[PDB]
């Protein structure tokens, strides 16, 4: 349960917050889990997805072991477009079918100055929590 | 219209009472707020009693009761003078003082004087500064008890 009197735990308000959250909050919301190897190495459970990360689709019709590069992140649609998850329209042109980040696993991270520090902060907090538990 | 021996009654619901109905759905919240304020005041006055200033022994008018003894508004000036306590210093020490009370009988005066004597006997006066000046109690009876007194100080029992 939740005991803080300032948390909502209400269907209408939570849905309103989720569907009206700003762009920076939606960035955190659209987070995807890391692969087993990346999790073991960086000691990070999950990271927000980026524009050009390698990724595998886990759930859906496009389920497979292909490691496709993300093409873009449509945060207005709460979805991402990846390299080869696409379907042909009536006129033959291909269009990328959106895949939710929660149904996708990151295989390779795009490491930048901000990405490395986010990973370091998450690993440090994880280690501190584990030490407090021990 | 009356019907077969009903009580004759006159309800007072001829005004716009529905506009002035006062609900009590805020009663538990009000009780919680009062409790929080009381605890905050007690933490504010760390060594002072939670209840507050000492109250004198007082009897009741209206011969209906005529026997009950309750807490008074404050100690009378004559009672303070007999006890040898300055009226202004009593306020700073924590003695309730009101200047309107009279003193007709000697029994109440003597009882209040005895109560003041007992209060000064069991009063621990912290010094103004850490280095104890005159009239300040010894540090021996300061570390043992630096806590508040729950309930009224020296409660009155009939």
């Amino acid at each position: 349960m939740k005991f803080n009197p300032f948390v909502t735990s209400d269907r209408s308000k939570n849905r309103k917050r989720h569907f009206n959250a700003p762009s920076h909050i939606r960035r955190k919301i659209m987070s995807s889990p890391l692969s087993k190897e990346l999790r073991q190495k960086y000691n990070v459970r999950s990271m927000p997805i980026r524009k050009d990360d390698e990724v595998q689709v886990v759930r859906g019709h496009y389920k497979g072991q292909q490691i496709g590069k993300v093409v873009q992140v449509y945060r207005k649609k709460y979805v991402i477009y990846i390299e080869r998850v696409q379907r042909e329209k009536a006129n033959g042109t291909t269009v990328h079918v959106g895949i939710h980040p929660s149904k996708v696993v990151i295989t390779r991270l795009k490491l930048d100055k901000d990405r490395k520090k986010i990973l370091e902060r998450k690993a440090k907090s994880r280690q501190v929590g584990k030490e407090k538990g021990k | 219209a009356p019907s077969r021996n009903g009580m004759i009654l006159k309800p007072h619901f001829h005004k716009d009472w529905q506009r002035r109905v006062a609900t009590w759905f805020n009663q538990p919240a009000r009780k919680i707020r009062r409790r929080k304020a009381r605890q905050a005041r007690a933490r504010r006055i760390a060594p002072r009693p939670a209840s507050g200033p000492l109250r004198p022994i007082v009897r009741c008018p209206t011969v209906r009761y005529h026997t009950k003894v309750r807490a008074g508004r404050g100690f009378s000036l004559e009672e303070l003078r007999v006890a040898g306590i300055h009226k202004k210093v009593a306020r700073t020490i924590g003695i309730s003082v009101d200047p309107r009370r009279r003193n007709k009988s000697t029994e109440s005066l003597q009882a209040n004087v005895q109560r003041l004597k007992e209060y000064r006997s069991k009063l621990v006066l912290f010094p103004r500064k850490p280095s104890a000046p005159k009239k300040g109690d010894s540090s021996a009876e300061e570390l043992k008890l630096a806590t508040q007194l729950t309930g009224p100080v020296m409660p009155i029992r009939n």
Binding site: M1, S9, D10, R11 | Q18, V21, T23, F25
Partner: protein, 258 residues
């Protein structure tokens, strides 16, 4: 309650006799859809509900302290008698003894895993097992009114003092923690059914006597309270009916129906 201004915010006047309308207060003038429609009535569209709900309805009910003590004492008494507990749906088939008294080391527990291990060892884990299957979706508007999920009640746990037992028995679904001094009838008899499966600590079990007292001793924790007297002592009427004393003064029954 509903808003007091509901329905009467409009300014409607009734068209008198001489027109095909049915003498209903209708909206005055305008070039809109809501013009000469009908308002201020319970049967009209929009309108105002008959007898609007008011906030000062007598929501709360007062119950006598002695009656509440009687009810909670009856619930504690019916916590025994495994027939009632089983009929209440609690699976206590493997419980070694229904007045399940456990040591005081449970208060020292601070881990839900330790709590689960204790429940499994005491064989009360089947009730939580049943609660897990009982987890389901509620029917009706409760889903959209913050009551979406429902589940059965698990075994209650009574503790003398909180030393971490509440923290340990908190993530297990259905478990309700109760202090002996602050027992709740609404949790001891959920739904008005007197049966309940409870797990006591040694200190709480011993403090029950100091809380309620026996028939020949006052409570000593409640100022003036004693256990209610029995209307009849020998409750087993089957034993009474076939006793020699009664049967010695009975006529021969007639079962030769004509």
């Amino acid at each position: 309650a509903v808003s007091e201004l509901a329905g009467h915010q409009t300014s409607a006047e009734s068209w008198g006799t001489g027109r095909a309308v049915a003498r209903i207060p209708r909206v005055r003038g305008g070039g809109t859809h809501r013009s000469g429609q009908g308002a201020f009535g319970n049967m009209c569209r929009g309108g105002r509900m008959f007898a609007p709900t008011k906030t000062w309805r007598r929501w709360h009910r007062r119950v006598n302290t002695t009656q509440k003590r009687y009810a909670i004492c009856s619930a504690l008494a019916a916590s025994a008698l495994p027939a009632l507990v089983m009929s209440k749906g609690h699976r206590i088939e493997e419980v070694p003894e229904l007045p399940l008294v456990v040591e005081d080391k449970v208060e020292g527990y601070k881990k839900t895993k330790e709590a689960v291990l204790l429940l499994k060892k005491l064989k009360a884990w089947n009730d939580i097992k049943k609660v897990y299957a009982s987890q389901r979706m509620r029917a009706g508007k409760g889903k959209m009114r913050n009551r979406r999920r429902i589940q059965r009640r698990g075994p209650c746990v009574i503790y003398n003092e909180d030393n971490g037992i509440v923290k340990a028995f908190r993530n297990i679904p259905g478990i309700t923690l109760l202090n002996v001094t602050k027992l709740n009838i609404l949790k001891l008899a959920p739904g008005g059914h007197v049966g309940r499966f409870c797990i006591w600590t040694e200190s709480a079990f011993r403090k029950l006597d100091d809380l309620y007292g026996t028939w020949r001793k006052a409570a000593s924790l409640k100022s003036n309270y004693n256990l209610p007297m029995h209307k009849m002592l020998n409750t087993d009427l089957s034993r009474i009916l076939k006793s020699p004393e009664i049967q010695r003064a009975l006529r021969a029954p007639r079962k030769k129906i004509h």
